[PDB]
């Protein structure tokens, strides 16, 4: 603090600042430009430094709009990273990376604060809690048991149901959870954030009648922002959760959507900083940045952190390096496919490529694990036989093989549940299925005693009882 | 006997067609992989040369 830096070169989002020869800010400090807007009032464009350029010059990163800054402006160092308010104050307000309440409400308690940049905890302070908790979605319950306090990533494309699934998952989990949640918007649709805002104001988890009684903290660094904002909003949301687990020491929920926009902002700013480009154009500090943001989402003996984050895949090619690194930091993955998304099965979570770490005999029980791997067996058999029946036909197989064909073509329907928030896209009342119901229904489908139902009567039903009701309805409507 | 014989001839012709089609798809796949590797190296060395 108490110095003056000169803007020397502005190539868009990157900034070259010069300082007096002695006093130089550390890396990951927070400058603050005493600039002005088009109206001339003193407006701030907060700024994070990334690199000592040398010859008493540094290269920086602008956290907000660059249009309006001139070569010859002034800037002041804070001597510390971008501090963010923490605690019970930040509960029920929209938040940006600059620690500003964005919703039209008053100021905040500014005395409880903490910096953004920190590291992973002590390795000897890690909680080995592997307890299952019930979600509700049939695929998410049976074939991919979710670790409480473990990280969860929903690998998908654009427009297959990542946001719908995560919104219904908030809807189902946060009301019956035992801890304070935090949602972050990282490079996504603004009106969809407004829809979440209204739909969770009305659904009482904001409980906007009295402030500080809300159990969610909303942060938003969405698409229309400069790459510094999306580059550090995820860090800000994680640091809020880290306060809530380090001093309030309780379980939290942290939904970091969309983490690929964080990595993409890093690449957009990294190509301009002079980095020799890595694979297809991402930064070279890809895996270390992904870990440095990921590894501080963790459990501990003070409180675990459950983290269902939406992660985007370009062109539905899982080979690409940003998902190729994000697979390496996740516990129970979920890979929404374009195949089921175009086929009509909603949710389009592919039963096959999805695979977790909790589904073990000694972690979930023997019969759940057994019926789950038998379901995976039947589906793998069907997608194996697909390329054969593509040209062969339906009448050159065995009774075992055609039996598994019809059974898997029932199963792929049965794993589709009409969500609460899917009513606008489906037209079906609210359904929430139990785990016992799912395992019982899959034993009813697999054990052969349902080979006489209508095959289309398994689609978007909640219970296997409702599948029997669909069979009765369809046969009654056909026979009149 | 005649229908099993005619079906045997049809299966043999399908196996020959699948042979030729497999060879052509292999040629095109090798070409696609080569052009993809070349495009990657080109864009990488271009982005590096830029800086």
């Amino acid at each position: 603090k108490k110095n003056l830096g000169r803007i020397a070169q502005i190539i868009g989002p990157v900034l070259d600042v010069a300082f007096p020869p002695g006093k130089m800010p550390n890396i990951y400090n927070a400058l603050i430009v005493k600039g002005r807007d088009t109206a001339g009032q003193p407006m701030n464009v907060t700024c994070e430094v990334q690199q000592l350029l040398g010859n008493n010059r540094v290269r920086a990163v602008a956290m907000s709009a660059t249009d309006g800054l001139t070569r010859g402006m002034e800037v002041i160092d804070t001597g510390a990273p971008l501090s963010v308010p923490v605690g019970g104050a930040t509960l029920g307000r929209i938040f940006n990376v600059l620690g500003e309440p964005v919703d039209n409400l008053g100021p905040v308690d500014t005395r409880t604060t903490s910096p953004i940049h920190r590291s992973a905890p002590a390795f000897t302070q890690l909680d080995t809690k592997l307890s299952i908790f019930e979600t509700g979605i049939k695929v998410v319950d049976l074939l991919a048991p979710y670790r409480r306090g473990g990280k969860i990533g929903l690998f998908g494309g654009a427009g297959v149901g990542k946001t719908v699934l995560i919104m219904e998952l908030i809807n189902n989990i946060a009301k019956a959870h035992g801890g304070v949640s935090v949602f972050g918007g990282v490079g996504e649709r603004t009106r969809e954030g407004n829809d979440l805002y209204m739909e969770m104001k009305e659904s009482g988890v904001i409980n906007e009648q009295n402030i500080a009684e809300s159990k969610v903290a909303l942060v938003y660094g969405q698409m229309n922002e400069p790459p510094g904002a999306r580059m550090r909003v995820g860090l800000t949301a994680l640091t809020m959760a880290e306060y809530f687990r380090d001093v309030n020491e309780q379980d939290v929920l942290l939904f970091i959507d969309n983490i690929f926009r964080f990595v993409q902002a890093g690449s957009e700013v990294s190509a301009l900083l002079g980095r020799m480009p890595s694979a297809v154009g991402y930064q070279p500090t890809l895996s270390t940045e992904m870990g440095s943001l990921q590894e501080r989402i963790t459990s501990t003996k003070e409180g675990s952190i459950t983290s269902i984050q939406a992660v985007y895949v370009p062109a539905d090619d899982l080979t690409d390096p940003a998902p190729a690194t994000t697979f390496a930091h996740l516990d129970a993955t979920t890979v929404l496919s374009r195949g089921l998304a175009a086929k009509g099965i909603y949710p389009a979570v592919d039963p096959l490529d999805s695979t977790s770490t909790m589904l073990q005999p000694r972690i979930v029980g023997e019969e759940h694990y057994e019926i789950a791997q038998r379901v995976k067996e039947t589906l793998q058999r069907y997608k194996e036989l697909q390329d054969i029946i593509a040209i062969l036909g339906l009448d050159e197989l065995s009774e075992e093989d055609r039996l598994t064909v019809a059974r898997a073509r029932k199963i792929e329907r049965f794993l589709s549940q009409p969500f609460f928030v899917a009513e606008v896209f489906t037209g079906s009342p609210g359904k929430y299925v139990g785990l016992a119901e799912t395992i019982r229904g899959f034993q009813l489908i697999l054990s052969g005693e349902l080979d006489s139902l209508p095959e289309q009567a398994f689609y978007l039903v909640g219970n296997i009882d409702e599948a029997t009701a669909k069979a009765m309805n369809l046969e009654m409507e056909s026979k009149l | 006997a005649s229908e099993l014989a005619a079906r045997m001839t049809a299966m043999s012709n399908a196996t020959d067609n699948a042979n030729e089609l497999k060879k052509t798809l292999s040629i095109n796949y090798n070409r696609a992989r080569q052009a993809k590797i070349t495009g990657e190296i080109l864009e990488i060395v271009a982005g590096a040369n830029a800086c």
Partner: peptide, 11 residues
């Protein structure tokens, strides 16, 4: 996603 569907069609 091109090489993936290419290899899978070969198989």
């Amino acid at each position: 996603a091109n090489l993936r569907e290419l290899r899978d069609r070969i198989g």
